[PDB]
Design an enzyme around this catalytic site. Structure first.
Site, PDB file in Angstrom:
ATOM      1  N   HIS A  19       6.800  89.002  35.119  1.00  0.00           N
ATOM      2  CA  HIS A  19       7.601  89.168  33.905  1.00  0.00           C
ATOM      3  C   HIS A  19       7.240  90.468  33.224  1.00  0.00           C
ATOM      4  CE1 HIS A  19       9.728  87.742  30.215  1.00  0.00           C
ATOM      5  NE2 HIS A  19       8.844  88.539  29.616  1.00  0.00           N
ATOM      6  N   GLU A  20       5.949  90.649  32.906  1.00  0.00           N
ATOM      7  CA  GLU A  20       5.415  91.822  32.225  1.00  0.00           C
ATOM      8  C   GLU A  20       5.559  93.097  33.063  1.00  0.00           C
ATOM      9  OE1 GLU A  20       4.921  91.608  29.096  1.00  0.00           O
ATOM     10  OE2 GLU A  20       4.614  89.445  28.858  1.00  0.00           O
TER      11      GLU A  20
ATOM     12  N   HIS B 195       9.163  94.368  32.755  1.00  0.00           N
ATOM     13  CA  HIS B 195       9.288  95.099  31.488  1.00  0.00           C
ATOM     14  C   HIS B 195       8.923  96.547  31.758  1.00  0.00           C
ATOM     15  CE1 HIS B 195      10.383  92.043  28.691  1.00  0.00           C
ATOM     16  NE2 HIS B 195       9.204  91.436  28.556  1.00  0.00           N
TER      17      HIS B 195
ATOM     18  N   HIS C  60      14.162  91.307  27.975  1.00  0.00           N
ATOM     19  CA  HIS C  60      14.300  89.875  28.251  1.00  0.00           C
ATOM     20  C   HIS C  60      15.763  89.571  28.583  1.00  0.00           C
ATOM     21  CE1 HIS C  60      10.651  89.545  25.499  1.00  0.00           C
ATOM     22  NE2 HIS C  60      10.199  89.152  26.695  1.00  0.00           N
TER      23      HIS C  60
ATOM     24  N   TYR D  52      13.425  83.550  28.083  1.00  0.00           N
ATOM     25  CA  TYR D  52      12.519  82.712  27.295  1.00  0.00           C
ATOM     26  C   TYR D  52      12.913  81.235  27.339  1.00  0.00           C
ATOM     27  CZ  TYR D  52       9.700  86.191  24.678  1.00  0.00           C
ATOM     28  OH  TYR D  52       8.800  87.156  24.310  1.00  0.00           O
TER      29      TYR D  52
END
Ligand SMILES: *[C@@H]1O[C@H](CO)[C@@H](O[C@@H]2O[C@H](CO)[C@@H](O[C@@H]3O[C@H](CO[C@H]4O[C@H](CO[C@H]5O[C@H](CO)[C@@H](O)[C@H](O)[C@@H]5O[C@H]5O[C@H](CO)[C@@H](O)[C@H](O)[C@@H]5O)[C@@H](O)[C@H](O[C@H]5O[C@H](CO)[C@@H](O)[C@H](O)[C@@H]5O[C@H]5O[C@H](CO)[C@@H](O)[C@H](O)[C@@H]5O)[C@@H]4O)[C@@H](O)[C@H](O[C@H]4O[C@H](CO)[C@@H](O)[C@H](O)[C@@H]4O[C@H]4O[C@H](CO)[C@@H](O)[C@H](O)[C@@H]4O)[C@@H]3O)[C@H](O)[C@H]2NC(C)=O)[C@H](O)[C@H]1NC(C)=O
Ligand SMILES: *[C@@H]1O[C@H](CO)[C@@H](O[C@@H]2O[C@H](CO)[C@@H](O[C@@H]3O[C@H](CO[C@H]4O[C@H](CO[C@H]5O[C@H](CO)[C@@H](O)[C@H](O)[C@@H]5O[C@H]5O[C@H](CO)[C@@H](O)[C@H](O)[C@@H]5O)[C@@H](O)[C@H](O[C@H]5O[C@H](CO)[C@@H](O)[C@H](O)[C@@H]5O[C@H]5O[C@H](CO)[C@@H](O)[C@H](O)[C@@H]5O)[C@@H]4O)[C@@H](O)[C@H](O[C@H]4O[C@H](CO)[C@@H](O)[C@H](O)[C@@H]4O[C@H]4O[C@H](CO)[C@@H](O)[C@H](O)[C@@H]4O)[C@@H]3O)[C@H](O)[C@H]2NC(C)=O)[C@H](O)[C@H]1NC(C)=O
Ligand SMILES: *[C@@H]1O[C@H](CO[C@@H]2O[C@@H](C)[C@@H](O)[C@@H](O)[C@@H]2O)[C@@H](O[C@@H]2O[C@H](CO)[C@@H](O[C@@H]3O[C@H](CO[C@H]4O[C@H](CO)[C@@H](O)[C@H](O)[C@@H]4O)[C@@H](O)[C@H](O[C@H]4O[C@H](CO)[C@@H](O)[C@H](O)[C@@H]4O)[C@@H]3O)[C@H](O)[C@H]2NC(C)=O)[C@H](O[C@@H]2O[C@@H](C)[C@@H](O)[C@@H](O)[C@@H]2O)[C@H]1NC(C)=O
Ligand SMILES: *[C@@H]1O[C@H](CO[C@@H]2O[C@@H](C)[C@@H](O)[C@@H](O)[C@@H]2O)[C@@H](O[C@@H]2O[C@H](CO)[C@@H](O[C@@H]3O[C@H](CO[C@H]4O[C@H](CO)[C@@H](O)[C@H](O)[C@@H]4O)[C@@H](O)[C@H](O[C@H]4O[C@H](CO)[C@@H](O)[C@H](O)[C@@H]4O)[C@@H]3O)[C@H](O)[C@H]2NC(C)=O)[C@H](O[C@@H]2O[C@@H](C)[C@@H](O)[C@@H](O)[C@@H]2O)[C@H]1NC(C)=O
Ligand SMILES: *[C@@H]1O[C@H](CO[C@@H]2O[C@@H](C)[C@@H](O)[C@@H](O)[C@@H]2O)[C@@H](O[C@@H]2O[C@H](CO)[C@@H](O)[C@H](O)[C@H]2NC(C)=O)[C@H](O)[C@H]1NC(C)=O
Ligand SMILES: *[C@@H]1O[C@H](CO[C@@H]2O[C@@H](C)[C@@H](O)[C@@H](O)[C@@H]2O)[C@@H](O[C@@H]2O[C@H](CO)[C@@H](O)[C@H](O)[C@H]2NC(C)=O)[C@H](O)[C@H]1NC(C)=O
Ligand SMILES: *[C@@H]1O[C@H](CO)[C@@H](O[C@@H]2O[C@H](CO)[C@@H](O)[C@H](O)[C@H]2NC(C)=O)[C@H](O)[C@H]1NC(C)=O
Ligand SMILES: *[C@@H]1O[C@H](CO)[C@@H](O[C@@H]2O[C@H](CO)[C@@H](O)[C@H](O)[C@H]2NC(C)=O)[C@H](O)[C@H]1NC(C)=O
Ligand SMILES: *[C@@H]1O[C@H](CO)[C@@H](O[C@@H]2O[C@H](CO)[C@@H](O)[C@H](O)[C@H]2NC(C)=O)[C@H](O)[C@H]1NC(C)=O
Ligand SMILES: *[C@@H]1O[C@H](CO)[C@@H](O[C@@H]2O[C@H](CO)[C@@H](O)[C@H](O)[C@H]2NC(C)=O)[C@H](O)[C@H]1NC(C)=O
Ligand SMILES: *[C@@H]1O[C@H](CO)[C@@H](O)[C@H](O)[C@H]1NC(C)=O
Ligand SMILES: *[C@@H]1O[C@H](CO)[C@@H](O)[C@H](O)[C@H]1NC(C)=O
Ligand SMILES: *[C@@H]1O[C@H](CO)[C@@H](O)[C@H](O)[C@H]1NC(C)=O
Ligand SMILES: *[C@@H]1O[C@H](CO)[C@@H](O)[C@H](O)[C@H]1NC(C)=O
Ligand code: NA
Ligand code: NA
Lengths: 533, 533
Positions: free
Chosen positions: A91-92, A95, A101, A150
């Site tokens: 996920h990070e 980014h 997101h 999320y």
């Protein structure tokens, strides 16, 4: 979702530094996350050699990252406390690669509603939208199953959700934490114009007449036949079962009509390895005799021999009848090769033969141990859904057991336990820095489309119990008395894992359960070499 | 198959020159071939503006090309006599892009046998193999259905074949001349790292719960439902029929339970046009009343209005009941937009509603006319397989008919005929340079996976008959007397096409026949502007 700008693009190989501040378990998990990028994307990672701009993975407050290559030199990326999860690391990094997101998409308000008064003060910056002039959707629709999306509870103040999906069917769907979605990979591969990968080699489900270029040749009058069914078994292929069943195919070595000793080979096309270590995996079915066996050979093509060097690497004997069985074969081929499948009719009462489907070859390590749970669905939400794995020994010699709890009404739990073993007298106690990786396999016909659920824990030899002793100390000294399935007594140490491994709704999705079978792959390795980086 | 070397790579946009030596029909077909590259690949073409290296398409001896960007400046490419076929032009450009023939693959001898004594003297150079150090297979298997693969008859000396496929099932399979194979595109897109295309916009088969990001909202209590079946009809979706039927989905506007006048809209996600002209296509099913209608709107988003500009672009009324119907809607949107589907319950005895599936949007021209043949399979190899299309008028006003011959035991034939029309008194005779493009549609759920069979002919006003007169002269003057289905008499001019349009074995493959339906798309346009280039 993607950032607008060419300046925010990293080179295909990202320079990285795994800072010493990071937790030992985090370090091992971040390297496992790179292995997922190497198999499913063209994005590779290499330790920083002095490049101008690089990613500095450190232990800060929580899990966060800048969006895209900021071109500041040392670009920070935090994997703090409780962020030591493969999906969290993926996920990070998405980014860092240039993605916001999924609920940040310019059109997000047409699919979800942000309940602003329910977000914790100082965590709204996570729910920001970025318009066309700032973001690109890359012609891909809003994805509720995105790993970049999320959960409904994300930074909630109370029990009421912060993200309410306009369609009620997606309420519990958003926020999945398993792997990249097909849509995530599509956007990422389009952004960096990905053509290949480092780890992916081949996937063969036999859905086309050319059978992935697999050649079947034999001077024994015996042949591998592409069939959709076999009268004695199986009634249908493995690839499609909880999909259509009879519109799918598999290769079959009929042993019922051939002489004893007769063999038929099924060879792969010429394959070119890039790493030097591989993992061959396939599903086998036996409707023949227990004497019938499958032999796996490797035909390596060197310069000194153009006819090749055939080497036997596995003898699969006494294969259990009437069910699809998943097998793994560890390979260490460095030159161009051909995988050779050899079926052999043995001395015993046969009535069918050997079937093979969903063959996947990747340049990855095979799982150390495999826990195969049959008739799984009966245990979901069952009072008798308290399962303990058979015993296993790690690479360094530690004895261990896995506990899977399905008795809960909503979530499945998984726990790693050290148990009393034979090598215990010569082992280091408390057990120092052994990373145990538990993976709930998504039995998808294509390895590249597998969203396998994974959780890793590391043994901390300083982790003290709720009363003076060490948590990971000798089980004979700190554990509880237990009984093996046969009646023999042993000592089961402390249980370490999670109570929310996967929800029962997610467990019952994709292909985690296939033919009422489940496979939990296990890898236990020493990660003590990561303390000094 | 692919050439080894970076020097042989053309820029993503290739500079071209369509030389004046080329046949008028060839010129129109070469530009149609570029349209296939613009939809399925990231490779574009633009007229030569003074670039160092470019492709010079001219009329030489036969059809040939150099393999890869030779970096010689003016790179020749011949499209000689009888090479005016879209697939032939695609084949020769795949050579230019850096690919050899499929039977040139380093591993070709493991799949096919070259019968050297049967090849015509001086045409062996077409059957050359190129090893690993010269060629790359790009981890894709040998493809018998490749457009780069020769037929068994390729340059044969006699009736015995030159290419004998080791597997007998592929004997008549090799040498298909329709379009790129999924494997052809995979190798080409991997070689140039293709991410997008110019023409492709969207494909929606409703196989996922997120329904390609399509939003259904209504203040009428009416809604579009994602169903796998409808009790009154259809029993299954369009996407999968000759595949699985009940595992596929479609959107449905139930008119049986709503008030008369009630509407429900189904909107697309925000779409970004790159060309300014589009073609929306979908399959419709009606189980409701003949009064029920579908309205297609476009919601264009300008700077002066963020709420959008809704414009009605099509009113589909009195839709025939109990069968899937293919529809095309011509669009000319230049700004970001949303396709708006509006179902409307009318005044009449309904029992179901309106169903929609396989929605495809591309930046291409819609077909001028569509010949839809129902209950097709009965005509294949039938003495009554001599079909004539209904009459049609071209853009310039010429009346025409299409003749499809399926009575033959092996091949299907198609022929373009000029017929006596109303505008005949004010038309130019003989008919000058009108390109008539006949396309047998492969009704695949994804436009990008369609291998549609196409043939184009151009009207030559100098083409003289077998007795003094002009072939394309006024049909009243040179044609034959015929009768329209109602009984009215007319004059049918000369028939021009081919006797080997598609084989009956190929016709019965892929999705050319779907629900025993066939669609032959027609486009007749003036190409006289191509004589001066
Ligand atoms: C009810 O249920 C209970 C639960 O199921 C049952 O309990 C089980 O019972 C079994 C039978 O009694 C027990 O089996 C015994 O296991 C031990 C331990 O096995 C593990 O460790 C081995 C040693 O590993 C060390 O060395 C390697 C390098 O050589 C390192 O890489 C390791 O890290 C490790 O090093 C650490 O430890 C040493 C000290 O030991 C330190 O010095 C180091 O510093 C390190 O700290 C290891 O070899 C084992 O792995 C092999 O076996 C696996 C299973 O077969 C297999 O998957 C592996 O691939 C591997 O295969 C190789 O060996 C097998 C044979 O075992 C071959 O077939 C194969 O081809 C490979 O070569 C494993 O990780 C083990 O030592 C015992 O073996 C002895 O006895 C068997 C016969 O029973 C012989 O075949 C062996 O040769 C051996 O013989 C010894 O004794 C001889 C004298 O008799 C002597 O001459 C020999 O020299 C030798 O010392 C057993 O197999 C099982 O552990 C136990 N489990 C639990 C949790 O309780 C219960 O029994 C049942 N009851 C009933 C009635 O049903
Ligand atoms: C048994 O079976 C047989 C086979 O099926 C039957 O035979 C058929 O019978 C039909 C009925 O008799 C015949 O229909 C008639 O067709 C003609 C011709 O149609 C075509 O040409 C039109 C003209 O195009 C020129 O102009 C445009 C620009 O304006 C250019 O772009 C063109 O290139 C072209 O230009 C060339 O030609 C001119 C000279 O004409 C030169 O000057 C140029 O240099 C060029 O060389 C064209 O408009 C037609 O297209 C329209 O119609 C299509 C079908 O409806 C439709 O798909 C198109 O989208 C387009 O739609 C527009 O028009 C329709 C109405 O037609 C509207 O609904 C729509 O909204 C659009 O506005 C086509 O390409 C046609 O002219 C006839 O029309 C007259 O009669 C109808 C009523 O019947 C009226 O509605 C018309 O307004 C028109 O009226 C005339 O007469 C009036 C006096 O009465 C006068 O006041 C008017 O001014 C006008 O002159 C017919 O529709 C059919 O052709 C025939 N086919 C054959 C092969 O035999 C047989 O009948 C049947 N028997 C029985 C008993 O069952
Ligand atoms: C035809 O193939 C044979 C098999 O090749 C292997 O298998 C295929 C499928 C591929 O995966 C190959 O990459 C792979 O090599 C060749 O024989 C092999 O030769 C290599 C050396 O080239 C040899 O490697 C050694 O392996 C041991 C580990 O022990 C293994 O073997 C034992 C006994 O079989 C087994 O019990 C174990 O479980 C292991 O599997 C390792 O310790 C050695 O290390 C030494 O060398 C390194 C060099 O860097 C040095 O740093 C160390 O300090 C140390 O001295 C070494 O890596 C393989 O074991 C062997 N394979 C088998 C199954 O025995 C064969 O090669 C030729 O014959 C050999 C007998 C030898 O003379 C080679 O030099 C020859 O090239 C090959 N033949 C031809 C003509 O190509
Ligand atoms: C809200 O949308 C309306 C519809 O837009 C069209 O449809 C959408 C779905 C998209 O596809 C758009 O790209 C498309 O424009 C807007 O109205 C439209 O305005 C344009 C001008 O901007 C106008 O274009 C003209 O079209 C004729 C061709 O005839 C068409 O229309 C008739 C009558 O309806 C019809 O019978 C025909 O079949 C055709 O469809 C063309 O000849 C014109 O050419 C002239 O201009 C060019 C300029 O380059 C010049 O070179 C020529 O020499 C010549 O003078 C011209 O292109 C569209 O016809 C019209 N749409 C319709 C359905 O009528 C609307 O725009 C605003 O209102 C208009 C009335 C006008 O005042 C515009 O200037 C305004 O912008 C738009 N409203 C807003 C606020 O955005
Ligand atoms: C998997 O289950 C079968 C049958 O179990 C029954 O059904 C369950 C849903 C539950 O209600 C149980 O209490 C029931 O006992 C086990 O037995 C097999 O049954 C089939 C019947 O056709 C027979 O052909 C097999 O040979 C049986 N297998 C054996 C090993 O005897 C089966 O054992 C269960 N699997 C495991 C691993 O326990
Ligand atoms: C398509 O065929 C049906 C039935 O035709 C029969 O079957 C053929 C295979 C061949 O043997 C023919 O000679 C037969 O006559 C046509 O009729 C439809 O039949 C169904 C029966 O359930 C009925 O519900 C429909 O309403 C009938 N259709 C009409 C318009 O009357 C059908 O007409 C044929 N299609 C076309 C376009 O001709
Ligand atoms: C969670 O909600 C509570 C309640 O709204 C917040 O706490 C304070 O509540 C009072 C009223 O009881 C408000 O006047 C304050 O504005 C609230 N905020 C602060 C900072 O005191 C609480 O802050 C919310 N968020 C967090 C981070 O807990
Ligand atoms: C993407 O296309 C580019 C075309 O230039 C390829 O990039 C070159 O790759 C070679 C190795 O094959 C390198 O030596 C060059 O430095 C690269 N050049 C540039 C401009 O990046 C690239 O390999 C293609 N990607 C794939 C995986 O095919
Ligand atoms: C097609 O085959 C014929 C027969 O083999 C070739 O014609 C000649 O045949 C004689 C024997 O009858 C041979 O000695 C010659 O070598 C043949 N070749 C020539 C050039 O004369 C014929 O050439 C073959 N190929 C072509 C292009 O027709
Ligand atoms: C392939 O990746 C490259 C990354 O550099 C992209 O190439 C650049 O694209 C921009 C426009 O977006 C051009 O202005 C540059 O000149 C290009 N640079 C190079 C080195 O080619 C390219 O757009 C990517 N392809 C796609 C379709 O995403
Ligand atoms: C207990 O286990 C059996 C399988 O042996 C299973 O079928 C049953 O549902 C479980 N008990 C309950 C009450 O669910
Ligand atoms: C890290 O590894 C070195 C290996 O020599 C060891 O001495 C050191 O104590 C380790 N660090 C910690 C914090 O345990
Ligand atoms: C003639 O047409 C009918 C359909 O009307 C078809 O069913 C039949 O097979 C054809 N005749 C022959 C002899 O094939
Ligand atoms: C090509 O087009 C021009 C247009 O002015 C025309 O004069 C010329 O005759 C055409 N060429 C041929 C060969 O017909
Ligand atoms: Na399969
Ligand atoms: Na569908």
């Amino acid at each position: 979702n993607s950032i607008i700008g060419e300046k925010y693009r990293w080179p295909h190989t990202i320079p990285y530094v795994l800072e010493d501040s990071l937790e030992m378990n985090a370090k091992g998990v971040i390297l496992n996350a790179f292995e997922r990028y190497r198999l499913k994307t063209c994005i590779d990672f290499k330790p920083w050699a002095g490049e101008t701009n690089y990613i500095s993975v450190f232990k800060g407050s929580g899990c966060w990252s800048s969006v895209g290559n900021r071109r500041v030199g040392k670009q920070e990326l935090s994997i703090g406390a409780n962020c030591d999860r493969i999906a969290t690391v993926q996920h990070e990094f998405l980014h860092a690669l240039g993605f916001w997101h999924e609920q940040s998409r310019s059109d997000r308000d047409d699919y979800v509603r942000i309940m602003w008064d329910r977000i914790l003060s100082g965590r709204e910056h996570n729910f920001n939208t970025y318009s066309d002039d700032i973001s690109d959707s890359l012609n891909v629709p809003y994805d509720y199953t995105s790993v970049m999306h999320y959960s409904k509870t994300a930074f909630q103040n109370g029990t009421e959700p912060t993200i309410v999906t306009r369609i009620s069917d997606f309420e519990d769907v958003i926020g999945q934490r398993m792997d990249f979605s097909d849509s995530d990979l599509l956007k990422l591969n389009q952004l960096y114009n990905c053509s290949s990968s480092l780890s992916f080699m081949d996937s063969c489900s036999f859905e086309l007449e050319n059978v992935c270029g697999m050649i079947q040749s034999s001077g024994d009058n015996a042949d591998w036949q592409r069939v959709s069914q076999v009268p004695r078994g199986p009634e249908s292929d493995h690839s499609n079962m909880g999909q259509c069943q009879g519109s799918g195919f598999f290769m079959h070595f009929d042993s019922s009509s051939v002489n004893v000793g007769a063999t038929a080979v099924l060879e792969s096309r010429t394959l070119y390895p890039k790493r030097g270590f591989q993992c061959l995996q396939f599903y086998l079915y036996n409707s023949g005799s227990e004497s019938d066996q499958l032999n796996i050979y490797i035909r390596e093509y060197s310069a000194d021999n153009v006819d090749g060097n055939l080497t036997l690497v596995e003898e699969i004997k006494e294969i259990p009848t009437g069910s699809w069985q998943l097998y793994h074969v560890t390979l260490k081929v460095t030159k161009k090769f051909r995988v050779v499948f050899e079926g052999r009719k043995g001395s015993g009462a046969s009535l069918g033969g050997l079937s093979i489907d969903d063959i996947n070859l990747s340049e990855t390590r095979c799982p150390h141990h495999i826990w195969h749970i049959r008739n799984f669905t009966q245990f979901i939400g069952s009072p008798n859904g308290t399962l303990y794995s058979p015993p296993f020994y790690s690479s360094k010699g530690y004895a261990f057991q896995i506990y899977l709890n399905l008795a809960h009404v909503t979530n499945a739990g998984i726990y790693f336990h050290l148990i009393s073993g034979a090598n215990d007298d010569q082992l280091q106690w408390p057990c120092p820095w052994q990373q145990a990786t538990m993976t709930l396999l998504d039995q998808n016909p294509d390895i590249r489309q597998r969203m396998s659920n994974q959780r890793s824990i590391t043994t901390d030899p300083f982790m003290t119990t709720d009363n003076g002793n060490y948590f990971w100390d000798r089980p004979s000294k700190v554990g509880t008395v237990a009984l093996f399935s046969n009646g023999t007594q042993f000592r089961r140490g402390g249980g370490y894992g999670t109570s929310a491994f996967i929800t029962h709704e997610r467990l019952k999705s994709r292909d985690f359960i296939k033919g009422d079978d489940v496979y939990i792959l296990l890898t236990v390795e020493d990660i003590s070499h990561l303390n000094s980086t």
